[PDB]
């Protein structure tokens, strides 16, 4: 398919360079991944400090490079807990210049305290499924298992 070949071109040219999760109230980086978590067909793992569950909001800063242009780069992320979808997150970056490196910052706000899930319940049981799109074209689907430490 024309569309499959293009998706593959974009992916071959795409990578996540680094990513921070920063406490938006203190400024402190709590977690910094340097692995390319866009890579599909393998389960990635991430260990995050459990005190991230106490933040009122987190700044997620993602640095990525793309050889190909994208008209409307966006993400859909699902949070699966023991295979149940609990949450769905949507983020839009927009136009990506060909051969560019870009930092994308987004604020993820905590739910009310009474709805937050405990670390000991979550750890090892959460999968984040990320679909990377250019508008309606699915470029990659990646999976990351989270451990809260």
């Amino acid at each position: 398919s024309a569309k499959d070949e293009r998706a593959r071109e974009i992916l071959r040219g795409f990578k996540l360079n680094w990513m921070n999760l920063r406490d938006a109230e203190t400024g402190k980086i709590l977690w910094q991944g340097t692995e390319d978590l866009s890579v599909p067909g393998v389960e990635h793992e991430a260990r995050v400090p459990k005190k991230i569950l106490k933040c009122k909001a987190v700044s997620r800063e993602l640095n990525f490079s793309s050889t190909e242009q994208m008209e409307k780069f966006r993400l859909e992320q699902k949070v699966y807990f023991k295979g149940q979808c609990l949450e769905e997150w949507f983020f839009e970056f927009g136009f990506v210049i060909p051969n560019s490196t870009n930092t994308w910052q987004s604020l993820i706000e905590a739910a009310p305290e009474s709805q937050m899930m405990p670390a000991s319940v979550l750890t090892g049981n959460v999968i984040i499924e990320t679909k990377f799109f250019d508008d309606d074209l699915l470029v990659s689907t990646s999976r990351v298992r989270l451990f809260y430490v």
């Binding site: 933040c55 993820i108 706000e109 905590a110 739910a111 709805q115 937050m116 959460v126 989270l146």
Partner: peptide
């Protein structure tokens, strides 16, 4: 918003 983040 999130119950895990």
């Amino acid at each position: 918003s999130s119950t895990i983040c």
